[PDB]
Amino acid sequence: GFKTINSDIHKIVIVGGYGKLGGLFARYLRASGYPISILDREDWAVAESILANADVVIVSVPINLTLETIERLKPYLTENMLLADLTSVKREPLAKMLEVHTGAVLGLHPMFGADIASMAKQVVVRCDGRFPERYEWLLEQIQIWGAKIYQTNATEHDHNMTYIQALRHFSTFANGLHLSKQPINLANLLALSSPIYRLELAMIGRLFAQDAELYADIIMDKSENLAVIETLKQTYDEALTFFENNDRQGFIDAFHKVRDWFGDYSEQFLKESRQLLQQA
Amino acid sequence: GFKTINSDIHKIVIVGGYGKLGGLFARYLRASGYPISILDREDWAVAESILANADVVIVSVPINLTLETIERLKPYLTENMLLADLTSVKREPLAKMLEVHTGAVLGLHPMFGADIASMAKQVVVRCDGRFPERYEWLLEQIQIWGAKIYQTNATEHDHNMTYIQALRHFSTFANGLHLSKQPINLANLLALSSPIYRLELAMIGRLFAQDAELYADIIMNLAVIETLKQTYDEALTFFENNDRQGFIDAFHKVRDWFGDYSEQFLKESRQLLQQA
Ligand SMILES: NC(=O)c1ccc[n+]([C@@H]2O[C@H](COP(=O)([O-])OP(=O)(O)OC[C@H]3O[C@@H](n4cnc5c(N)ncnc54)[C@H](O)[C@@H]3O)[C@@H](O)[C@H]2O)c1
Ligand SMILES: NC(=O)c1ccc[n+]([C@@H]2O[C@H](COP(=O)([O-])OP(=O)(O)OC[C@H]3O[C@@H](n4cnc5c(N)ncnc54)[C@H](O)[C@@H]3O)[C@@H](O)[C@H]2O)c1
Ligand SMILES: N[C@@H](Cc1ccc(O)cc1)C(=O)O
Numbered sequence: 001g002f003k004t005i006n007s008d009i010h011k012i013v014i015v016g017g018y019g020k021l022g023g024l025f026a027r028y029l030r031a032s033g034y035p036i037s038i039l040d041r042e043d044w045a046v047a048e049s050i051l052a053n054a055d056v057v058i059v060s061v062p063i064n065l066t067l068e069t070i071e072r073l074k075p076y077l078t079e080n081m082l083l084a085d086l087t088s089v090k091r092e093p094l095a096k097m098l099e100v101h102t103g104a105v106l107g108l109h110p111m112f113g114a115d116i117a118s119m120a121k122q123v124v125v126r127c128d129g130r131f132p133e134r135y136e137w138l139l140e141q142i143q144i145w146g147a148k149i150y151q152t153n154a155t156e157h158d159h160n161m162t163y164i165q166a167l168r169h170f171s172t173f174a175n176g177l178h179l180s181k182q183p184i185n186l187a188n189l190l191a192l193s194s195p196i197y198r199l200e201l202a203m204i205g206r207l208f209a210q211d212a213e214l215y216a217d218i219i220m221d222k223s224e225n226l227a228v229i230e231t232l233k234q235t236y237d238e239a240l241t242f243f244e245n246n247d248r249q250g251f252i253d254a255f256h257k258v259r260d261w262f263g264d265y266s267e268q269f270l271k272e273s274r275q276l277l278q279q280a
Numbered sequence: 281g282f283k284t285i286n287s288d289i290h291k292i293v294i295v296g297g298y299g300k301l302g303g304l305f306a307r308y309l310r311a312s313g314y315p316i317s318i319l320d321r322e323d324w325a326v327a328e329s330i331l332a333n334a335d336v337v338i339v340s341v342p343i344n345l346t347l348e349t350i351e352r353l354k355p356y357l358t359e360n361m362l363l364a365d366l367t368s369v370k371r372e373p374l375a376k377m378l379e380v381h382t383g384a385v386l387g388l389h390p391m392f393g394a395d396i397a398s399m400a401k402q403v404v405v406r407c408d409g410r411f412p413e414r415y416e417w418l419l420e421q422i423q424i425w426g427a428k429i430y431q432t433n434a435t436e437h438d439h440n441m442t443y444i445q446a447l448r449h450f451s452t453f454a455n456g457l458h459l460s461k462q463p464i465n466l467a468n469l470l471a472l473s474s475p476i477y478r479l480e481l482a483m484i485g486r487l488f489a490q491d492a493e494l495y496a497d498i499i500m501n502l503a504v505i506e507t508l509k510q511t512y513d514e515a516l517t518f519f520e521n522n523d524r525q526g527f528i529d530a531f532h533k534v535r536d537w538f539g540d541y542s543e544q545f546l547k548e549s550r551q552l553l554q555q556a
């Protein structure tokens with residue numbers, strides 16, 4: 001149960017609302033006192049009646065269907081409505097929402113999966129479209145759940161996701177792929193693993209419990225993503241050289257330079273990770 | 281304070297005892313009622329008196345100095361002593377301990393760093409050298425502190441460390457190296473990061489807070505890192521060829537290799553972060 005920030009909101013439609021993320025937001029919104037209607041894959045025959053008199057429309061469909069879904073909403077949108085999305089990429093969905101709708105437009109990116117037990121300390125990225133004064137209530141509602149909002153423009157958002165998501169999930173993918181080809185039994189590795197070592201494997205394996213299509217569409221979104229993963233391969237080759245050459249001091253010098261780049265974050269991360277495992 | 285499993289142990293010598301791991305073991309053993317003498321980098325001129333009447337000698341020096349350090353102990357060792365190590369590699373240190381000492385010999389590998397706040401649920405690998413009946417007390421003592429003992433031979437230990445340590449730390453090293461060359465500011469990435477995404481970066485940056493020498497010696501294994509290089513290529517090909525279904529099919533096959541561990545790891549990681 002959560003405080004209802006805006007009691008003048010009488011109907012919220014979630015497009016893709018039987019999905020994992022859309023469903024999660026539907027639950028949180030219902031628990032905050034807002035009536036929710038769902039428009040999912042088999043409901044378009046009655047889109048007109050589902051969307052009729054909506055105050056808010058939220059789009060949470062597969063990345064590769066998002067832009068066509070936004071266009072499909074066009075005939076049913078009225079100017080008083082808020083149009084928003086939850087998509088992992090922002091530049092193109094935000095531009096498309098602003099093109100199809102003349103009213104308030106808000107881009108969101110929840111930086112978490114649908115398996116969260118609570119919204120406490122989870123981050124949602126805010127990219128303004130139009131009329132932010134009309135949707136302040138929704139940003140405040142999300143914070144009532146305990147989430148934190150961070151604001152960027154949609155282009156900067158996607159630029160940062162190049163590193164945060166495309167690079168990182170590509171890398172984890174390659175690590176899991178590699179492990180899967182090795183002549184080893186995972187349970188044998190786990191028996192020798194203390195908590196930190198178990199967590200090393202968990203951070204790789206947990207990726208594969210999720211939807212392949214999500215990670216495919218994130219990584220494939222733009223040519224900057226291909227470019228950054230091509231450079232990861234070049235760096236892997238550079239790192240390898242130290243071990244082929246048995247150049248222990250070269251490795252150490254590089255390790256020390258990388259520590260200076262992290263700065264005090266290296267020691268903070270060591271501490272945070274230890275505390276995470278100690279409690280648990 | 282921990283229960284003293286064996287009250288007949290009157291002197292334990294830790295070679296490398298002012299170090300991070302040696303110092304940690306010295307603190308646990310002192311707290312378990314065992315008198316500790318330290319033999320560190322400067323102390324070899326008085327090694328005769330340090331090692332005199334020792335019941336146990338534990339080696340905890342840099343990996344690259346470990347075998348020559350064991351060799352250097354031979355003149356001060358007597359048959360009744362227990363000789364043991366904490367080294368991250370087991371096959372060469374164990375053999376060299378069996379070579380220079382006629383008495384009880386035990387190989388240990390603590391699977392953790394010195395910054396632990398307790399031994400609860402930490403793993404120590406056990407590789408028997410000689411006369412395990414003589415050192416059961418110490419295996420029990422370590423468990424009194426809350427650690428788990430897992431037993432293997434030194435060859436199988438070393439084989440598993442290829443994957444658990446060499447592979448994983450090399451890959452984390454290459455990822456931090458790569459990140460350090462990107463046109464980004466870490467604080468800015470962190471401000472967009474929910475707890476799971478902060479942990480993605482934490483798991484890389486925390487490597488670099490530790491001793492570069494340790495990871496250099498552990499990694500230097502080459503085969504598995506060279507094959508990782510081959511897998512990076514296969515993975516990249518999906519994105520270069522815009523082969524989405526290929527990627528999805530490969531992702532599904534990896535999930536099947538992890539089996540139910542994928543979902544268990546998703547749950548464990550969620551729980552770890554929610555507790556925080
Ligand atoms: N699950 C996550 O970790 C996560 C995290 C952040 C953002 N997102 C975003 O959520 C969206 C994907 O949703 P999900 O991850 O919950 O996956 P999902 O597959 O579980 O949900 C997607 C839903 O959209 C529905 N759908 C498909 N075509 C439709 C159509 N034409 N009209 C209406 N509904 C349609 C599906 O039936 C499904 O219920 C993407 O925008 C993605 O970037 C997901
Ligand atoms: N630190 C870890 O996370 C970790 C984990 C598991 C195992 N280990 C093992 O710990 C051992 C020691 O490393 P540490 O991590 O505590 O690093 P460290 O540098 O803190 O400790 C090494 C100690 O050995 C001393 N030393 C150097 N040369 C010596 C010599 N000739 N004779 C006696 N002492 C000497 C140093 O002065 C120092 O006090 C290695 O065998 C390593 O594999 C370390
Ligand atoms: N990467 C997150 C889930 C997620 C996926 C895609 C996103 O856009 C955001 C979050 C996790 O593994 O838990």
Ligand SMILES: N[C@@H](Cc1ccc(O)cc1)C(=O)O
Pocket residue numbers: 196367368390391392393486487494
């Ligand atoms: N890898 C552990 C520390 C460690 C290092 C070497 C070892 O042999 C064992 C454990 C960590 O990052 O916390």
